Amino acid sequence: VRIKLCIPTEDKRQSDNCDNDAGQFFILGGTNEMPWNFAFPYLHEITDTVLSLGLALDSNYYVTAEVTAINGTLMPTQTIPRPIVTYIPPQGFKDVNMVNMDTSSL
């Protein structure tokens, strides 16, 4: 499983900058494998490459996966549920406060 780091373009262009690869991991399995699903999400630290791109880790981007079988056979992206970006704020951190009292009707 190859981890590509994508930056959106606001257009019809389909030009999503997924050029840069963020990570990589591997999965063992086989036929007559015991069916299984992790009770918790596997997390792969991609912070370094995100900082390298010169964009904030908090800011928007996404992560996509190129899944090659051990066969060498490239597989559909649908084989694995889509990756997400998990962001962990610097503790302790308060996100922005609520805007003030009603003026005047809610």
Partner: protein, 131 residues
Amino acid sequence: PNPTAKHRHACCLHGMATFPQWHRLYVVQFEHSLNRHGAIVGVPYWDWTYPMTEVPGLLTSEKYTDPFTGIETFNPFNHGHISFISPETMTTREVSEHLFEQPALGKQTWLFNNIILALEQTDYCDFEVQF
């Protein structure tokens, strides 16, 4: 499609504009093999441009005798083996008499008329399709 694909199609280009290009490069592929395998010349052709009376000797004769070492051997160009089917599986041939047509009074051999017809074309794609 790629060597790893689940579903594959035939490799070579046919019935499309780049057909000559693909097969040009495909011949130099075969050419470089036998030049490095000790052929002093490039890949020979037999031109259908001239009317045919017969299939060329190095193509048709089943056995070949080396004049220099005097040993009779099987002619490598007579046929080819298809490895994956079985060791005992060879290409085979059947010759149509349509190959050996000769010019008549006003008439001219199929290939001649149709080769010119292709060579007449001024547009590459119009050339390619006829060709």
